[PDB]
Design a binder for this molecule. Structure first.
Ligand SMILES: [Zn+2]
Ligand SMILES: [Zn+2]
Length: 222
């Protein structure tokens, strides 16, 4: 259990194992602190993030923290849906020549929310390799948003569930303004059906757990 932080504590990275870390940032909204999780992947050919952060201020500092820790550059990011906590650092990414991967739909919705457009290069099942690190993206259907995807790391059996999966502490689904609450259950079932061997599940917000987080989210939807 190893967490690196900036001095304020607004940005932290937590070790799941040597090459996979959770990044978490606090964005403040009407006096209220909200954490958001993504992943940091340490690969032979650079660093890969799953999701950016609330804004460019945080995204830029996040990048510098990880580039210093691992002594190499952030080359790619995978955007799991078009909300601010996921997509708010797009300008930082473009400015630094960091490729922003997404589904066409996510790219479409990003444009329509006024954000810079990610690549729209991902299909519903896409396998990527960065150095020796394998990354699978999967669209399970509508849930938290229309466009939400999950990121699977087959070599670690680690699932970045994003906001499709709630933490164990969550007692409601949170922000459902853009959600499809009647399809969300099916969409989690598609995840459960596809990955029979989940060791860790990282939710969009809150503590890392395991396969249980997906069952908890199903309860929250009943
Ligand atoms: Zn969201
Ligand atoms: Zn979320």
């Amino acid at each position: 259990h190893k967490v690196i932080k900036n001095e304020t504590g607004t940005i932290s990275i937590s070790q799941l194992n040597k090459n996979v870390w959770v990044h978490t940032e606090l964005g403040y909204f009407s006096g209220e602190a909200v954490p958001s999780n993504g992943l940091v992947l340490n690969t032979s050919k650079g660093l890969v993030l799953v999701d950016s952060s609330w804004d460019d201020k945080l995204t830029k500092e996040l990048i510098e923290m990880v580039e210093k820790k691992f002594k190499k550059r952030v080359t790619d990011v995978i955007i799991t849906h078009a909300h601010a906590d996921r997509i708010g650092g797009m300008k930082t990414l473009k400015e630094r020549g960091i490729k922003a991967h997404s589904t066409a739909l996510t790219a479409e919705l990003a444009k329509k929310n006024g954000y810079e457009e990610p690549l729209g290069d991902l299909q519903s099942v896409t396998n990527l390799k960065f150095g020796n690190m394998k990354v699978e993206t999967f669209y399970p259907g509508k849930g938290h948003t229309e466009d939400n995807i999950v990121v699977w790391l087959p070599q670690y059996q680690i699932l970045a569930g994003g906001c499709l999966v709630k933490s164990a502490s969550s007692k409601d689904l949170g922000n459902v303004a853009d959600a499809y609450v009647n399809e969300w259950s099916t969409s989690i079932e598609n995840v459960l059906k596809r990955y029979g061997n989940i060791n860790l599940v990282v939710p969009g917000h809150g503590e890392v757990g395991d396969r249980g987080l997906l069952l908890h989210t199903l309860d929250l939807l009943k």
